[model samples]
Target chain A: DLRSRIEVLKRKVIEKVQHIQLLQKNVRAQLVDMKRLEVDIDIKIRSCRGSCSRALAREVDLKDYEDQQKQLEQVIAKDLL
Target chain B: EIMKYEASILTHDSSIRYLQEIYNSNNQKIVNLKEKVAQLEAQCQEPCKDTVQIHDITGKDCQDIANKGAKQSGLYFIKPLKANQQFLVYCEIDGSGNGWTVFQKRLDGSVDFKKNWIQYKEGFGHLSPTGTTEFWLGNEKIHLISTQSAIPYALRVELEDWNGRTSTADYAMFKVGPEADKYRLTYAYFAGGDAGDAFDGFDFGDDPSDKFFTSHNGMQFSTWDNDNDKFEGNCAEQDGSGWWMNKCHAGHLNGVYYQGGTYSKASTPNGYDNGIIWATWKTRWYSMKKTTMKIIPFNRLTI
Candidate 1:
């Protein structure tokens, strides 16, 4: 009876150990993936910043819009006249 | 008789020693394996170069951090149960000593909530960049935090309409089961909130069948692809997000965000009742403009 009980406990312990090992492997994989994602997100952020800066710079470029408007007005006047 | 009993014991003495030895060996192996798993988990975060480990680490959850004198409401590191590495969580604290760990937040619909099972399981969306965004705090992580302490936790949901009218729903007991159980939703003893009990089932216009179909308690989570719902049709597919759908839902916060007022069925993707709905408070059509769900440990008094 004692031997049977011990055997059952031993099997359970072995199963627990196997489960923990799998969890350990998964956590390791997750760490690697995290590092990969960190780099990817960093690059994405940098790219977004560059595009954002260009957009912001374009927003304040009044002269460019003014010149385009003037050219449109000249074309309209030429056509209308 | 004494001699007979003595002889029986003598015969089993060797067996007892053998069993004892096996038990000790198995115990030692379990301990060693646990230590190894903890070590691997600790490696999830990078080591700081300028600062030591002791300086940066916070408490187990936001409640612990607040108890240890965290006055401000912002981002903080929390090391929930069984997790060796601490992760960032947004903490809500008031001067009156209320600590809340926010699990979900939606304001302007900056982050898409129509994600699949794995995306919802692992969580999606960054913590709001400008305090006007959204996020789901990962089902696995929520399970860990809610089940961590000996004292169970309670959930509080705060919602606001476009008209600036705010309401809240509080549950005395709130818990999320592990992934094996499909992260089942459990809550009870709804009180102290203006928003009525929309989670637990309710009768619709004196109809008995409505109670069985819409109750969210004990329902396993379902996404568009992973159909764990009770309905013949996938509720998540029509709802456009993952949720603990019974036959469907009376209140689904993860539903598609409508700008303001009531949205017509034509506006929905699959053309069913979909929106950030709180049926008991304002019915299914009125979508909440802003929503936040947070949890705190339940003290003995509240339970």
Candidate 2:
């Protein structure tokens, strides 16, 4: 009975390790997505200003993207901490 | 019974060793994770700081462009000219390091092709009424016979070269009418330096010390007619009227050491009225110069 109980505890610990790994993976993926979106927003803002067309649209989009990026960073900090 | 107890003790020791290894590995993983997070945070902060630096640089560039353009364009104002009015034009080149010579011409002509040209002498006594210095030319009355419309004229001023030659700086312009009533005399000048420098450039009638014959250590001018003549006035009288006065005027002229020294015999024709005035002040290397004048009709006024 003691051997069986030890095995059960080991299994539970491994499962917890897997759960932490999954969380890390999710966080990394979100960080990558946020970085890509930031780059895209920057490009769009620059191009719109260069063309002198749809400036307001580009500004709104960029602002929204920045807000989303900030939210993602907050989530990353929370998870890591 | 002793052998069995030793075997159980060995198993317990192995299990404890294994648990200790796992705990150490997990702690190291946490430390590595924390380091990665710190690096990412630094990366994020770097960009924000870079963005602020870029913003400051762009703002400075824009201001530089604006100032460069301003130097090229200069300043302007309007004056009304009536028929048969006598007017006096006065300008002062002061400060240090360099001197500027002023010139005038009709807008329709070039600087080299100007018909009327007058050069003012330098030094403080030239501007002093008590010094008996005749640095400016006086006209009696300008007679405008033709009822034709007024004409805009340009007044060009150039800085003097090191060898005392005039430059082609083409600094200012004014619009004059055919009749004294029809012409709008527009003028503008720059003045002031860091400190311990003479104030140069054009000043309007708004400041009493800025007027011709005033003790402001700057360039000034006035207008004259058959009834009353107007010139620059003292700081005391100008300040009493709520007009703008510079520290160069009050502090330098009416200060303790120089009290009333610069103001003596400085007077203007009473009840002499001035028209609309437009002017500007600027700081140069070490000195200041001013250009102030009235535009009268070329043909309408007898001078």
Candidate 3:
């Protein structure tokens, strides 16, 4: 499945990782926050019970989702929307 | 989860380093997890299986599947698809809609339901397209989702006519591959699904709906009802996400704001009609359809 593709991409990621590190530490910290949220969401994913967690993830209020996107946009310095 | 990981690696440089550290930190656990996922996938994959060939289908079969009722026939696959091997979905039209092509779309890790999906060429994936044909060239090897993911996926095959309007042929199916092990889901379309008969536009195509998103652990994609008239439905700029509903959108692009184009007349053009296309239009997600009779890859599985 994705294993093979991920393996191919690991090399590409390594090459890009070396760059843009010292460019911004604040963004680095912000990313950590993003990762944490990602984990929380991932947990909901693992605990997915017949799509209930999915429903929970997409609750009417998507403030967090929108916020994460905005943060990613600012950190990345471009509107990917 | 795996796709998210891949997206993490591909989205940005920082994420690469960040995820790498995580990968390296939990090397043992990660390896075990990889093995488990791979083994489970391997067990699910078929060791040996026959696949479809060009000769397997004829005009007669295509005509049969193109009927009004066949369009609604849920849970079908193409012949020669043989169940397990990877495949390329080729489409042809009879008359309903002709010359309409296919394209690919991906979920933007940055955004949510509505605007979260984008085309691979729009630059999010970081894989530079050599030229206009780049994305199309790469779609030859689309992976059908594993049965373990979602069952009875809903699909909506569209018919965009020169009339500057559109119609849809909805269908559904239980799985992709005839067997199992074809566990990865990749939405391939200039539009989606496929109509292989080449006889009419109504023949083939599968723009999968809810089943597609749910298959990816609730990774949302967009959907549209291009009928345009009285039953005025979702269109070009007007799209939706979250949960499964095709007749309309989730909520104006994340609960607020006009998304792209609009449905009313007077617009310069749309997804295919006026030929006014957004560079990322191809990957913009849509739902409610599945592997169609015309698509070679899916045809065999329908049997």
Candidate 4:
């Protein structure tokens, strides 16, 4: 039974590994977009004269994306089967 | 020893199965959000720079009365239409026009969604608590009788829990009602009939298209059946009609739809068999002497 359990867990590990891999690929794409948005937002932060709040809000939500990535990493390392 | 150990395994054999269920439930929500994010991305930053405005019923803008302005697929709100006005509600949810489900209008033009609104069943409706909010239009009112209007909207319907963020279409509309001295209601129950084809509203003799009067799940038609004093809406068998009516109780008409429906509301299949979607009765009518449609918008109509 332990062997069976270990085998099942191994298969799950493989599944998680595969899922994490695919998830990271999407993550890379989101990261690329984040970088582009950051650059555009940086330009605004550096140039906008009205509602500095607008630029701040964009950057504010951007960090949330970063933390979202971080959460996935934690799940893979600590919560994966 | 192995037998005892095997018995223990039998008692709790599937630990990861629940994790799978929870994760699967969660992952669909994640996908649902990701799809919405695409909608916002294409619409926001600039998309949200919306000019939500109200037009006359003649505007016939969009039937978005059931959907949020500009967003499709979820429950949303707009400044109530009055005397000839509308929100051209549309969506790209399922692409083209397939995604837009019609609003089931109450006979009084109230758009009483209670036991109405139809869509394909996804998970086991039987998978949750019986009376939990199965879908959006649960006694929640979305319109209000207002002056000439202009504005945005909010999305309400969704994937069980996660919402289907909708976009408004902004179409031309018309004044609701006050047409006749009295109005009447014609509704069916459990969406009777074989394979759900019988599922359509009874005749109101108005804008009859694919439009319906989707009853609220389990709300029962007409509030006729009161247990205390023995009142009833003339439910098929509630009043003890003949042969077929004898088997069908009028009490089962309310509540939300679920495969394993509770109380009088179980997701019935082929029980009434006129192609079986509107099984409560072949057709029952009730006349409302007089009334005006009310919008009653919430202070903060966020969904």
Candidate 5:
């Protein structure tokens, strides 16, 4: 009976091991997939960086104009008063 | 002559009226432009400011940081979507160059494992870029990382015994539930490395010490202060550490680190041989010299 139980456990162990191997194989495949996804996100973020900085510069220009506009309005109010 | 004087007077009056009208028009234009510029600035700043502020070194998670060209394994900041705050974690780039977020490490016993519920939840231990020290990467943080992405995650447990032998246990799917569940352990599909699947509790089939309750899959975490273990006695107190102890753990990595392998139950404060025990690997009596637990989100392309 001990011999038979040992055999049974051995079979079960191998089966479990095989499943592990399969899991590893798929996990390896997924690792590549992960890298691909990572690269894709990185590319988009980098692209956004270019546009983002350009927009910030435009905002700065608008900010200057707004200040000048406010100053002009103050002068007009004083003259009108 | 009177008519001519009146005509001159009316002409001068018309000149003043024209000037006044011009001034009033300029005032109205200023008000309109003021409102327009205010909105224009708001529209311009909001999107650009938010998008441009993305930190170079920081990312949504460790893998994201790695993808952003963090080649070395070290302390890196990450903010998972599930977490409100960003925290530093040890990012490990494996041989295959995949990024792993290490949550716990036990080396040289420099840190005390026996702690209260608050301490365990909040985390305590020394941090090292090389992972040379002991640390518990906070249960809440761990929960955030594992659940951050829709992609499934995997856990790797590396163990070393006093004899200098090393073994590993990898789980196909590993997740820790939220704080409401007391950070319950949920792992499935164990892979080999001599250090057996200690969490499932299936191995202790005939042990009368309540094997049914011993499986760690759904076991809520336990600490000295908050006793969530199924056993009548407090397992956390008995084990000299906080852990996902059911009745007790088959693999208690958080247990007190005992020097030179074998330790008597009496030597411990709680009289249990609870030293960094991985029962399946070296039996519960042998205290492991080192242990590290790391997690990585698997990119499920096939799934």
Candidate 6:
């Protein structure tokens, strides 16, 4: 009985590790996407110069991108273990 | 002891990963703030430029005289001798080097054709609309004769060095009647030391004063004596003795005199003769910009 229980625990631990690794990979992908989007937003803002309407639109888009980045970060924190 | 050590290692590994996540979040926040700051700074640049050249008293467009050459120094304007008449005159310097003096002459055909007939004398008198160290003429008057016929009137402009020579750049013409109510005037010049000295400029509104009179006030006939011993007053009375004084003396010199004659034609100088000194008259130097101004006549007077 003791051996069986130990084997079951080992299997559960392996599954948890795989799940954590998958979540970590998704988190990393999201981070990469966020970085690229941030760079694009920065470039767009710079190109707008002082056009108020365009700057406001860029700011709104950046905020939305940031929101997605925050959601990914929260998921990585919760599921990392 | 060995088991405790293993557990501690595992705990540290998890803690390290959590710490990395926290650090990344903080770093991203800092980046965001820096970008926001840069955007704000860029947005603020335009208003800064606009604020500097705003339409303040000193920054107004008084230097935009009509003629390119004539606008380079002193004030230029047209005053009507009669109802529907106009005359053009400008005061400026000809040479570019040191010891430039002020000159004034008529632009209209009414006066002689000499370009620079009137030149200011150095150390003799200083011209100002108001001030004890300078001269002030009375306001426009209808009965007074307009002295536009005079080729070059004797006017005084003060120089820093008393030894400096006078030139045609020093004198400015004054009209007798039909003056504008709303106008701008500027005066600029160099003071202290010689030609290398620093220069400055001043501005004034050409609002009509209460004592307007016709005719250009002549020199030597009148004396302006402020209580100060500097002898810096505008004198208009010409007593034939080459002793024309402006608003300075209190007693027998209290009046205006003609160029050659004496008697009933003479008048006593006002008790507050120095009261009319126009110290607020602006002064500028060196630059070719005329103290250009636009005058809007309030009444239906001939320009």
- Best candidate (score: lDDT): 1
lDDT of 1 at B34: 55
Per-residue lDDT for B1-303 in model 3, tens only? Answer: 535665655568566568556644555564465555444433433333433333222221222234422322111223223234322223333344221112222212222223322321121221121111212211112223222233333333333222334343323342222213212122332232332211111211234442221132112223332122112444323533321222222211122111242323233233222121111112213221111112222322232
Tens-digit lDDT string for candidate 4 (A1-81): 468766775565666556545555555555555556546545545454342334343444667677776765665543343
Where model 2 places Cα greater than 4 Å from the true spot, the runs are A1-10, A33-81, B1-162, B165-303
Ordered from best to worst lDDT, the candidate numbers read 1, 5, 3, 6, 4, 2
True contacts kept of each: 0.00, 0.00, 0.09, 0.00, 0.03, 0.00
Q: Report the C-alpha displacement of residue B14, candidate 3, in angstroms.
A: 99
Q: Candidate 5 residues A1-81, lDDT tens each?
A: 357655665565455445434444443444344344434444444445544554222211345445644554454322111
> What is candidate 5's lDDT per residue for B177-286, written digit by digit as tens?
88899998887677555678777664555567645566787789888888889889988888778899887878789988888878786785546767788777776677
**RMSD over all Cα atoms, model 5:** 33.3
Candidate 1 local lDDT, B107-201, one digit each (tens): 98888899999999788887642235489988988888888865678898999999999999888779999889999998777756898888877
Better of 3 and 6 by lDDT: 3
Model 3: what is its DockQ? 0.04
Q: Estimate, for each residue in B1-303, the C-alpha lDDT of model 6 and write its tens digit.
A: 233333553565586567568656756875786687577656634422221111111111112222233323333333333323322222333343111112221111122111110111111223321111221112221102123333222223332211233221122332222223211111223222222211121122232321121111321222222111113433322211112222222211112222222123113343222111122221211111111111211121121
Minimal lDDT window, size 10, model 3 chain B: B195-204
Model 5 C-alpha lDDT versus the unseen true structure? 0.72
Looking at candidate 4, what is the lDDT of residue B62? 33
Which candidate should be chosen as best, given TM-score against the real structure?
1
lDDT of 4: 0.29
Report the lDDT of model 3 for residue B287: 20
| Candidate 1 per-residue C-alpha lDDT over A1-81 given as tens digits, one digit per residue, 9 for 90 to 100 | 367655665565455445444444444444344344444444444444433332112223446545654554453322111
The order by descending TM-score is 1, 5, 6, 4, 2, 3
For model 5, the superposed segments whose C-alpha errors exceed 4 Å read: A1-81, B1-56, B202-206, B300-303
lDDT of 2 by residue, B3-107 (tens): 334355346556655655665565567557656645544433322122111111111111122222312111111112343332222222222211111122111
Residue B275 displacement in candidate 2 (angstroms): 37
lDDT of each: 0.74, 0.29, 0.31, 0.29, 0.72, 0.30
Off by over 4 Å in 6: A1-81, B1-3, B47-273, B277-299
